[PDB]
Design an enzyme around this catalytic site. Structure first.
Site, PDB file in Angstrom:
ATOM      1  N   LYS A 173      20.804   6.141  33.077  1.00 16.72           N
ATOM      2  CA  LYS A 173      21.925   6.267  32.650  1.00 16.72           C
ATOM      3  C   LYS A 173      21.969   7.906  33.102  1.00 16.72           C
ATOM      4  CE  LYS A 173      22.949   4.954  28.764  1.00 16.72           C
ATOM      5  NZ  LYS A 173      23.480   4.333  27.533  1.00 16.72           N
ATOM      6  N   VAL A 229      25.072   4.740  36.285  1.00 19.15           N
ATOM      7  CA  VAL A 229      23.979   3.998  36.073  1.00 19.15           C
ATOM      8  C   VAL A 229      23.261   3.698  37.400  1.00 19.15           C
ATOM      9  CG1 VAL A 229      22.734   2.071  35.315  1.00 19.15           C
ATOM     10  CG2 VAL A 229      24.654   2.670  34.014  1.00 19.15           C
ATOM     11  N   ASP A 262      30.222  -1.344  19.531  1.00 21.04           N
ATOM     12  CA  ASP A 262      30.869  -1.607  20.816  1.00 21.04           C
ATOM     13  C   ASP A 262      30.230  -3.029  21.132  1.00 21.04           C
ATOM     14  OD1 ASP A 262      32.643  -1.089  22.661  1.00 21.04           O
ATOM     15  OD2 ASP A 262      31.676   0.167  24.008  1.00 21.04           O
ATOM     16  N   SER A 293      33.150   6.191  32.016  1.00 18.23           N
ATOM     17  CA  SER A 293      33.628   7.127  31.689  1.00 18.23           C
ATOM     18  C   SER A 293      32.588   8.368  31.331  1.00 18.23           C
ATOM     19  CB  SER A 293      34.815   7.191  30.587  1.00 18.23           C
ATOM     20  OG  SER A 293      34.181   6.655  29.350  1.00 18.23           O
TER      21      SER A 293
END
EC number: 2.7.11.1
Lengths: 88, 293
Positions: free
Chosen positions: B54, B39, B144, B35
């Site tokens: 990225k 990469v 995360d 989202s």
């Protein structure tokens, strides 16, 4: 499903303003809650089946309602938007 | 205050390296997409080594302000169990983050296709807790932690990755309030929108230990809303078969999956837990990897 009935009433009101219609809300029949966002705020899509009277006669409608809230649904939403409204 | 795309670009330029890394990187290949953006793998001109890049479009973010966090917070923090961030650049309307390319894939591939033994689970937990102890001491919260965020090197070393959602606490701002993470791994206090600190990473790590035992986090068969209500409201989640897990691993897990954040074990406390005596060398990880299954 009290919180749901308020979203269903909003959907009917928004439809009436959009299509110059005069549908009168009766009840929620069935409701699906779906989380679509969980970053910064909760975003929930509601798929509602509701009964409303058209020209006095009770008919069934499917409404899609998009809500944003700081807390997990169905807490007070700071944004509401009718995405879809059609007779079933 | 309302700022233009171009004002935002100027602000982000202050915290990244100047210029364009296409001067020293060539043969870009897209390997992943989120989202956030994509990469790529690229070849470094001097050494011929592969690095990861990225790429995140400044115009296509839910919260573009979040693009500051990883490039500002992780600039000066380094650890053998944290994926190396080399440099960041603005290239047109994209933020580029140049990082270590780990060639062993993600922990997710292992937990979805094999049953890890307790030595292998201890090995992963030791490496992740070393990373978290270091980060938590600096006031960094990852926010995360999950199998997808854990990358393996070709030789079976373990590194924490995916710092896009990270935050920094201090004496003057000791708590975060942001809703960030992945539903099934979120701490109850995150779902409940309570002010929180580093403890949220220890809850998420507990859920990742359940991934390594059962193959999936608790309630992974249910929609996110249903799962998050259970996390928020229910007793801490349990493994599928308590009799298949050692008393020392159940004790380890019991210190992480604690609802009251102040009663949850710290990374430093968990580093001293006897479960980590089962930890093995990187060679005990290699046999789990897709190439050698």
């Amino acid at each position: 499903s009290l919180e749901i009935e308020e979203l269903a009433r909003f959907a009917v009101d928004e439809h009436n303003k959009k299509e110059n219609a005069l549908l009168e809300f009766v009840r929620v029949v069935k409701a699906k809650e779906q989380l679509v966002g969980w970053v910064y705020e909760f975003q929930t899509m509601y798929y509602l089946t509701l009964e409303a009277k058209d020209g006095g006669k009770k008919k069934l409608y499917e409404a899609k309602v998009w809500v944003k809230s700081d807390h997990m649904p169905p807490s007070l939403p700071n944004f509401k938007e009718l995405q879809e409204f059609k007779p079933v | 205050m309302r700022v233009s795309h171009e004002q935002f670009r100027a602000a982000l330029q202050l915290v990244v390296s100047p210029g364009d890394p296409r001067e020293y990187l060539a043969n870009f290949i897209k390997i992943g997409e989120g989202s956030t953006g994509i990469v790529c793998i690229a070849t470094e001109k001097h050494t011929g080594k592969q690095v990861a890049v990225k790429k995140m479009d400044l115009r296509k973010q839910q919260r573009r302000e979040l693009l500051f966090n990883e490039v500002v917070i992780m600039r000066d923090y380094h650890h053998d169990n944290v994926v190396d961030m080399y440099s960041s650049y603005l290239v047109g309307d994209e933020l580029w983050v140049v990082m270590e390319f780990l060639e062993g894939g993600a922990l997710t591939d292992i937990v979805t296709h094999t049953r890890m033994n307790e030595e292998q689970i201890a090995t992963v937990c030791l490496s992740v807790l070393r990373a978290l102890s270091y980060l938590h001491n600096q006031g960094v919260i990852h926010r995360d932690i999950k199998s997808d965020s854990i990358l393996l090197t070709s030789d079976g070393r373990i590194k924490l990755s995916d710092f896009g959602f990270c935050a920094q606490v201090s004496k003057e701002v000791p708590k975060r309030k942001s809703l960030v993470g992945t539903p099934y791994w979120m701490a109850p206090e995150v779902i409940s929108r309570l002010p929180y600190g580093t403890e949220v990473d220890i809850w998420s790590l507990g859920i990742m230990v359940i991934e390594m035992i059962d193959g999936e986090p608790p309630y992974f068969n249910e929609p996110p809303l249903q799962a998050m209500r259970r996390i928020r409201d229910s007793l801490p989640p349990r493994v599928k078969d308590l009799h298949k897990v050692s008393s020392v691993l159940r004790g380890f897990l019991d210190l992480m999956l604690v609802r009251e954040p102040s009663q949850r074990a710290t990374a430093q406390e968990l580093l001293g837990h006897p479960f980590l005596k089962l930890a093995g060398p990187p060679s005990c990880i290699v046999p789990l990897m897709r190439q050698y299954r």
